[PDB]
Amino acid sequence: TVEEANALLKWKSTFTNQTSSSKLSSWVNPNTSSFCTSWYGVACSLGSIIRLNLTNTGIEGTFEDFPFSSLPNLTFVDLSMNRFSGTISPEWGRFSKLEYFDLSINQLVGEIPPELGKLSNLDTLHLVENKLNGSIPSEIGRLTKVTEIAIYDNLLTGPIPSSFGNLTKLVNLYLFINSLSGSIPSEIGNLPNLRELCLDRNNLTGKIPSSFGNLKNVTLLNMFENQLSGEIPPEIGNMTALDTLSLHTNKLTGPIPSTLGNIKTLAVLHLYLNQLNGSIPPELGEMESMIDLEISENKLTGPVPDSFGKLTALEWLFLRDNQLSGPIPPGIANSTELTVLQLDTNNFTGFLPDTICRGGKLENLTLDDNHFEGPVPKSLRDCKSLIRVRFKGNSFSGDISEAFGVYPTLNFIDLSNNNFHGQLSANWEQSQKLVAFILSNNSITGAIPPEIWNMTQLSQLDLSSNRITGELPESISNINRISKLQLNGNRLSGKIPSGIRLLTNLEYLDLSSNRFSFEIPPTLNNLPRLYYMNLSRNDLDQTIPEGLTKLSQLQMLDLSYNQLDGEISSQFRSLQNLERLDLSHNNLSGQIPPSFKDMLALTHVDVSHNNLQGPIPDNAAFRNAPPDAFEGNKDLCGSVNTTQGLKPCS
C-alpha cells in the first residue's frame, strides 16, 4: 500500500554509507504497481506487503525508524547479513502474523525483549551471530508453533528458561557459542518433536537431566565444551534415534553408562576430556552403528572388552590418555574399516593382535608409552595403507627387516626405545613421502642402506643409540630437507662427509659417540639454521676449522672427547648466539683467545683436559665456571678474588 511504501522509504532514508549500486535503487514509487512488483525484497498479498527480504544487501543502519506500526501484515522478515546495529525493540512483537523472523549476522546488541514471545504464529526465529546479551526471556516459551530457534554466537548469559518445555513443536534448538549458565532444565527432555539439540560452547553446569531419555526423536545432541558435572544418566541410552552424541570437554564423572549399547543408530560418540572412570562397559560393543568412538582423556581403568570385535563399522577408536591396562583383545582391531587406532598413554600389555589391519585400511596406529611387546603381526608388516606409526616406549622385538614391509604413504614412524634387532632394509626407501624416521635406542646393527639418503622428504632422521656401523657417504647431501639429524651413539667410522655442508636446512646435528676419524670438514660454514652441533666422543683430529665460526645461529657446540689440536681460533667471537661451548678432553694448545670477551651470550664453557696456558678471558661464562672447567691443562692462570683452582697469573 502507499502507506506501507512511504513508511519503508522513511526508514530507508536513515541508512548510512549507501552506495547507489544498492538494490534499493528500485524503492522509488510508493504506488502498488511499483511497490508490489518492482521494489527489491518486497512481496505483497492483495496490495499489502507480507514479505521483506533484504538479506545481504549492504544496508548500514538501525531499526530505530523501522515502520513497526505501518506493516501490519508482515509475515516473513529476513534482514540477515547486513550492518544493522542498535537493539531489538519490543515493538517487533506486534507483528501478529510473523512466521519467519531472521535478524542474524548483524551487529545488534542488548537483550532479547520478552515481547518476541507475542509472535504466536512464529515458525522460525533466527538471531545468530550478533552481540545480544542478558538472559533469554521466559516469554520465548510462548512460541507454541515455533519449530526452529537459533540464537547461537551471541553473548547470552543466564539459564535456559524452563518454559522452553512448552515449545511443543520445537524441532531444532541451536544455542551454542554463548555464556549460558545454570543447569539444563529437565523440561527440555519432554519436547517430543525435538531432533537437534546443540548447547555446546556455553557455561552450563549441573547434571544432564534424566528426562533426556524421553527424547526419542533427537538425532544430534551436542553439549561439548560446557561445565556439565555428575554422571551421564543411564536414561541417555533411551535416546534411540541418536546419530551423534558429543559431551566432550565437560566435567562428567563416574562410569560410562552401559545403556549406550542400546542406541543402535549411534555412529559418533565423543566423550573425551572428562573425568569418566571405571571400566569400559562390554555393552559398548553393542553400538552396532559406531564409526567414531572417542573416550580419550578420561580416567578409565580396566581392560578393553572383547566385545569391541562386534563394532564392525568402527573407523576411529580414540582411547589415549586413560589408565586402561592388560592385554588388548583381537576384537579391538577387528573392524575392516578401522583407520585410526589411538591407544597412547595407557598401561596396555602383551602383543598386538593378528587382526590388525586385516581390512587393508589402517592409517594411524599410535601406542606410545604402553607396555606392548612381542613381534609385529604380519598383517601390520603387510599394511600398505599406514601413514603414522608411533610405538615409542614399548618393547616390541624381532628383526626389523622382517617386522616391517613397504609403506608408500608412510608420513611418520617412531620406534624409539623398543627392542628391534637386525639391519635396516632398503625397503624404507619406498616411503618416498616419509618426513620422520625415528629408530632411537633399539639394537639395530649393520650398515645404513645407501637408499636411505634418497628419502628426500625426510626432515627428521634419528638412528641414535644403536650399533650401526660403516661410513657415511658423500651422498648424505641428498637428504636436503633434513632439519634434525641424529646419528649419535653408534659405531660409525671413516671421516665426517663434506656433503653435510649442503644440508642447509639443518637445525640440529648430532654425530657424537661414534668412531669418526680425521678432520672436521672445513666447509661446514653455511648452515644458517644450525643451532646445535655435537661432534663429541669421536676420534676427530687436526685443528678446529674456522668455518664453524660462521654458523651464526649456533647455541651449543660440543667438540669434547676428541683428538683436536692446535689453537682455539679467535674468530670464535663471531658466534654471537653461542651459549654453551665444550672443547674439553682434546689436545688444544696456546692461549684461550682474549676475543672470548666479545661472546656476551656465552653461559657455559669447558676447556678442561687440553694443553692450554695463559690467563682466562673476561666474560661471564669463564667467571662463573667451576674449577673443573679448567683442570688438566698445561699452564693456565687465574685472577685473585675469583677461585677456580688456578695459580694466579704473575
Binding site: 545468530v128 547461537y152 541451536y174 580419550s296 580414540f318
Partner: peptide, 10 residues
Amino acid sequence: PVRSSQSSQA
C-alpha cells in the same frame, strides 16, 4: 542462515 554445530574429533 543457520547450521547445526559440529563436534570436532579429538
